[PDB]
Amino acid sequence: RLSLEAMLAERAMVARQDLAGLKRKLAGADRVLAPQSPEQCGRESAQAQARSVTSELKSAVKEAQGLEHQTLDFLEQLGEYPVCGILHGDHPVHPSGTHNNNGKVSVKRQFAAGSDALTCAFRFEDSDLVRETALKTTYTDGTWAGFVQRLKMQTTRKCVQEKVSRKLLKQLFPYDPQKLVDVSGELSELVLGIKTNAIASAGPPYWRTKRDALPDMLDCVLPLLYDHIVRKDLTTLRNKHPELFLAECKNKTDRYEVESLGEKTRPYFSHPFHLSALVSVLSQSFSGALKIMTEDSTSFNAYGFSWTNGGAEDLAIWARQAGEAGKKPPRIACYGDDTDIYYRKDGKLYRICPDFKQMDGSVDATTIEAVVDYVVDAHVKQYPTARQFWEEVGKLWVEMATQSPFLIDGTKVYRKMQKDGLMTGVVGTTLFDTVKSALAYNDWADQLMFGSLNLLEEKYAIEFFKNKHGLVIKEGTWKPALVNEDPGFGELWTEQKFLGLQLKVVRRENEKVYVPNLPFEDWLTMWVTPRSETETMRERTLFDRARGLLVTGAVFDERARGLMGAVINSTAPEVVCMRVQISDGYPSYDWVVSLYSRDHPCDMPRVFPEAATLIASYRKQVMDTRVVI
Amino acid sequence: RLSLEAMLAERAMVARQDLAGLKRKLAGADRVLAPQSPEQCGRESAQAQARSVTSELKSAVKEAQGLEHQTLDFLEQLGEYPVCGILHGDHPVHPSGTHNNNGKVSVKRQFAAGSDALTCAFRFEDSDLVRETALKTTYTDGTWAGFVQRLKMQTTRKCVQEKVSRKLLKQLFPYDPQKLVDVSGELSELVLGIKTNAIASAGPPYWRTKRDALPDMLDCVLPLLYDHIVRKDLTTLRNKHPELFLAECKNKTDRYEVESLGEKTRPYFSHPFHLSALVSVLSQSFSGALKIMTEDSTSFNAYGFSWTNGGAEDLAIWARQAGEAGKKPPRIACYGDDTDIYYRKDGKLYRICPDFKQMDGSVDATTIEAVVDYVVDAHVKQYPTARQFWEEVGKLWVEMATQSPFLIDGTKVYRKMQKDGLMTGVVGTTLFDTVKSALAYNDWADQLMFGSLNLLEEKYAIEFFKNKHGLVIKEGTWKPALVNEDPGFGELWTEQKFLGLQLKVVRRENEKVYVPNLPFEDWLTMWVTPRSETETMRERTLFDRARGLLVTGAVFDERARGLMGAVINSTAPEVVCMRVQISDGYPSYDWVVSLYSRDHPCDMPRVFPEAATLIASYRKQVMDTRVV
RNA sequence: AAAUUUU
RNA sequence: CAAAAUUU
RNA sequence: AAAUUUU
RNA sequence: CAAAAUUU
Ligand SMILES: [Mg+2]
Ligand SMILES: [Mg+2]
Ligand SMILES: [Mg+2]
């Protein structure tokens, strides 16, 4: 049946899954060890210290979770919605058990309290530093109090309608028309082309993951929706089946400061799959086309930027051609509220990296409608035949971004009082944020051309954004700094962070490679707060995260490189060469430097160079058949 | 992360493994039912009759398995061999537990006395006919007695050296030189190119399957063997490690007549992996090049022939251009001892389909050496740079086919006394048989050109092959028959079987398709004796075998088509659309006819046409974005 | 599967 | 993990 | 995985 | 199943 070559491939594939034999075969194998930091104490002592810290964190979190949460009076109320009765064959779309107290759609918000990574950290670095950094922040569900507080900040903020046109958006957000999907083709194929998180909630009315809910959305609800869209019949469908247009307001689990646990917890909105999917066609095509600022000088857009393969250097070469403030144009780039501003002053280059507080709450209805228009238009320009249909989708998109009815906890249904303010979680969220941001910063530069250079000062800039745009600058982020225009080996660009990373220069054979960087404390904080079950898979997760952080820029910090190296070298060979979804290479300093330089891509150095042959139990060995006998 | 199209494919692949949900999803689906025969009796009554037949067969088999087996005096004896001590890294090549009583290599022969196919048959066809056909034959390991008797027949037969040259073999077995492997390259790659049964025994000294034993052969034993081959040092390696050149004699499990259980049990020889692989390079390349008789008028070779895609018709058009016996050349084709002879007599076309008795025992040393030479030569002609090495492999091939030392049961080692007689199991077995056969039949035709037409008669032909070639014609197989040169719809070519099948013509659209056929009794015999455990997998096996038989030609017999249809239609939908190694189509009469006709290939009709969408839970439905 | 970033 | 961007 | 075929 | 040939 099979050939020997194929039989060997077939047996190699299975050997990487037989971890007992992999462990047996790789015992005592030559191993390329990573640069590593010495161990400070034993794994058992380290477990004890980790256990201790985890306990302190659990009790502080529980404390903050017991705080009273201010009422939800600031939201309009639409009573209770009935459970959707739509059936797809043998089963209902809305499952029988879930999200239904009786008749009415209900929802229960999750705030729970309460690490192998913290253990490792205690194993390889100074106890007191690990302790205080692991107590500064924590990955958690947040608190009811801070949830409601940030929700109020983002649903009730006094906004300022922006002054925007397609002319302006063409200027600030150039794209490449020929990279837009052909949006006139059948809807089914177009929807089948979009990408999505298979594990994410499909939202109402499916109340399961998207891979679970895909057929029910696809052959049942989406055709009904289409029927009613072209029949101009949407509001009677909204009446017959309210749950089809309902969202769920949810608390984002992530890294939070512990001291601020009762003030800060991000809210976001889960939308129905059939609506998000429909809009995603346009959204994702547009993301496909959008140029970034290193490609096109007029662009204010950094959404699509990459640090790797020259990106850092590109950012530098871009920035450093900014003009004298008041005379020539500055260099401004935005990714959401995360902005990077460069400007000159008596020839000398300066940089500012400001953030905005609850940026969603500052995004105005005019801006949202203008962006939806700009996208739909960008498509129907290239593909006129479908104009009407997608315009009818635009009307939906906007009502989804500004005025969706939504659940929070239990059966009550709410809605934002004003049209202004973005419902974070809607398709296009990041783009709306980026746009509003760039529009404001463009008005800023325009005011600089009219001699208002006192807008370069914290004092007046805060006023400007508050009064002219409704943007609240997270204080202390407007601190302009002198740029080291041409850094020497090991020197920073500035100490400021853009997209969470400092820019730095490193030596490579007398060349200067621009790379990301952070101080050790930051890398260690990221190490000890992973975002999330055999011993094996956990050991592998440790390995993977170490590699990841190294690649992100931890290899360019002394202490962090040592810690990640120690983790890697602890990893048992079976776990390194394991079949996972294998890569059994580690990132050396040199390889990562190559990753960020413009070099052609290439594979990581193998941890066990001769592992393939040791596993397969067979080298090739040249045997000449032309030999004389 | 993923796209919806891909997510749906991913979800479809897993739904075909969840048989509960598969059953649920297919509950009310349209089913393309196969042509079927009505039920003769209930499932429980049929179970009772099957149980009964199984009991009678078990006790007859046990009886025949207890018979005394005549001594092994007819074989040379070389005593006991020591267990090979070669190590490959951390473990020995010869595992610690197995095939070692102490110090010495030992082997234990398996004769066990051991049906729901029979159940199905009793359910859907006449009770008495099913009973007697299921008692005529049985799939079994055989008996010690018949094992030793046939071993004696194939190791001690008085042979007749054939009269052979490369000239003759070029004539009878033409090939296409440019389809031969470039055998001058590196050995590793060439050996990696050969195909093999991954589950088969690698034989001594590995004593495990070939996929288990592949690395040990590949990076350890094969280099040692090469070293000693080019160093001209083979016999001292044979001395240091005898088990490297040892074979295992084995009893073939298969379909046996119950009446003949103590007279007939096929022996064959499992050879070492490192030797078989090395020879396979040449053997398989040559098979790649070898022409067949429907390609080349001079060829006597039918090894490579296919019934499908016109093959049957090709056989007809070939045959019917045979000449008047004594004046012009006949048409003769061989596949092992299975031969097909066509000749004319006063213009009228005749056919003969004779077989030989234990043909391996009749295969002479001259023929084996000549074939090995012909193959090695065919290669080193095209690729001279590699001559010596492959010539040294030829010497091995020959000693492997004629004179291998071998085990049977226990520790004693034996060897064939004579060089004559082929050791079935060696690489190239079928080709050696085909050549010996064709050589004899060519001498037959040559005697026909010299006016000896009484060789067309059973009485003198049997003599001819016995005396001039050592070939013993299984009696009653030389019965020449008048060919229906141009058959009408539904008529046979002749009633004779070649490659186990009758030739027949069926109608399609006023056109005649040539197809294989067998009488019902034969299809039923094959049905009730399968060759080899959940409810699921057994229910699926019934389905698979029914499909298989239908495709082989059972769809062209009424009663057999009905039985296979009934089996297929019994198969629960979950089992049809199950993820297996899916195909969830059945072979309709029309599709099988297309298979044997010259039509372009195409897939079987789905049993459940709308099953894909029912499983995925989505049928595409065009919704146009250009609507007002 | 994993790392980082934004809302 | 609601939408997303970069990377292995 | 399955069917047929030769030794 | 020891070598194999044809086939899905
Ligand atoms: Mg912010
Ligand atoms: Mg025969
Ligand atoms: Mg015979």
Side-chain angles (χ1 to χ4, degrees), chain A residues 255 337 424 433 531 545 552:
Chain A
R255 306 211 222 271
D337 71 0
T424 282
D433 296 325
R531 307 197 247 261
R545 299 194 65 245
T552 310

Side-chain angles (χ1 to χ4, degrees), chain A residues 245-260:
Chain A
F245 299 92
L246 181 61
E248 175 187 28
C249 187
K250 303 182 81 163
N251 50 314
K252 195 194 165 199
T253 303
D254 85 329
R255 306 211 222 271
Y256 289 119
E257 311 270 285
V258 187
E259 193 211 29
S260 306

Side-chain angles (χ1 to χ4, degrees), chain B residues 54-70:
Chain B
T54 291
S55 275
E56 276 189 46
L57 274 185
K58 186 180 281 163
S59 68
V61 162
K62 276 261 290 163
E63 166 137 313
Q65 281 186 338
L67 303 202
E68 279 202 36
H69 67 91
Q70 42 161 322

Side-chain angles (χ1 to χ4, degrees), chain A residues 438-481:
Chain A
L439 285 183
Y441 283 112
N442 187 56
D443 211 37
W444 182 77
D446 281 359
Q447 296 320 288
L448 260 45
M449 285 299 209
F450 315 155
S452 295
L453 300 202
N454 64 299
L455 280 157
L456 293 162
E457 302 177 39
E458 187 153 34
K459 201 154 121 43
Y460 300 108
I462 292 185
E463 256 164 32
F464 176 76
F465 289 110
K466 194 63 200 103
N467 295 128
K468 312 279 142 184
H469 296 289
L471 292 173
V472 172
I473 295 208
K474 198 206 287 297
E475 205 173 6
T477 62
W478 198 282
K479 287 218 190 319

Side-chain angles (χ1 to χ4, degrees), chain B residues 150 266 336-338 354-359 472-474 477:
Chain B
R150 294 312 271 212
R266 168 168 267 88
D337 73 359
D338 204 342
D355 278 57
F356 297 122
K357 204 154 95 104
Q358 205 73 37
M359 152 57 88
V472 169
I473 291 190
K474 194 163 291 273
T477 62

Side-chain angles (χ1 to χ4, degrees), chain A residues 398-538:
Chain A
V398 176
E399 195 229 324
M400 230 173 89
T402 61
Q403 281 287 88
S404 268
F406 63 80
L407 295 166
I408 303 180
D409 186 85
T411 198
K412 269 271 144 82
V413 174
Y414 301 82
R415 195 205 314 154
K416 196 146 61 59
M417 258 191 181
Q418 38 161 203
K419 261 111 204 150
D420 294 327
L422 179 73
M423 300 187 60
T424 282
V426 67
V427 163
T429 284
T430 310
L431 182 65
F432 295 121
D433 296 325
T434 306
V435 164
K436 174 76 204 214
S437 178
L439 285 183
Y441 283 112
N442 187 56
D443 211 37
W444 182 77
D446 281 359
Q447 296 320 288
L448 260 45
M449 285 299 209
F450 315 155
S452 295
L453 300 202
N454 64 299
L455 280 157
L456 293 162
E457 302 177 39
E458 187 153 34
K459 201 154 121 43
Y460 300 108
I462 292 185
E463 256 164 32
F464 176 76
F465 289 110
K466 194 63 200 103
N467 295 128
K468 312 279 142 184
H469 296 289
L471 292 173
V472 172
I473 295 208
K474 198 206 287 297
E475 205 173 6
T477 62
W478 198 282
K479 287 218 190 319
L482 209 81
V483 175
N484 182 355
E485 280 221 55
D486 198 335
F489 308 147
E491 286 176 349
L492 303 189
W493 170 259
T494 81
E495 275 152 13
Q496 300 164 305
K497 295 150 65 140
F498 169 56
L499 314 161
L501 296 169
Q502 297 170 322
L503 185 57
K504 144 188 211 164
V505 165
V506 290
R507 197 216 326 165
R508 209 250 311 259
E509 62 195 298
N510 264 267
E511 302 174 70
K512 292 185 195 280
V513 186
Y514 286 82
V515 309
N517 189 40
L518 287 174
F520 177 59
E521 290 78 18
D522 278 322
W523 295 117
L524 179 55
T525 298
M526 297 193 274
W527 176 252
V528 296
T529 49
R531 307 197 247 261
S532 41
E533 257 288 303
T534 312
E535 270 275 66
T536 318
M537 279 168 206
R538 284 161 56 191

Side-chain angles (χ1 to χ4, degrees), chain B residues 153 238 388 514 559 569:
Chain B
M153 279 183 57
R238 200 178 272 109
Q388 284 148 151
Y514 290 83
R559 275 172 296 167
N569 290 337

Side-chain angles (χ1 to χ4, degrees), chain A residues 2 4-5 11 24 184-187 192 194-196 211 219 226 388 617 621 623-626, chain B residues 2 4-5 11 90 184 186-187 192 196 211-212 219 226 385 390 617 620 623-626 628:
Chain A
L2 266 174
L4 289 205
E5 196 180 6
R11 153 198 253 282
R24 192 258 310 165
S184 75
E186 162 182 19
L187 196 56
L192 288 176
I194 70 198
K195 308 191 172 157
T196 186
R211 64 152 138 61
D219 83 337
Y226 175 84
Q388 270 181 58
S617 290
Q621 163 160 357
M623 296 188 232
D624 210 33
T625 284
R626 314 181 140 181
Chain B
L2 264 182
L4 293 211
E5 195 184 25
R11 174 171 211 290
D90 52 88
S184 75
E186 201 265 310
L187 197 55
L192 288 177
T196 186
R211 64 153 140 60
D212 287 355
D219 83 337
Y226 176 84
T385 51
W390 288 111
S617 290
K620 180 150 182 189
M623 322 181 280
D624 198 12
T625 85
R626 311 177 193 235
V628 298

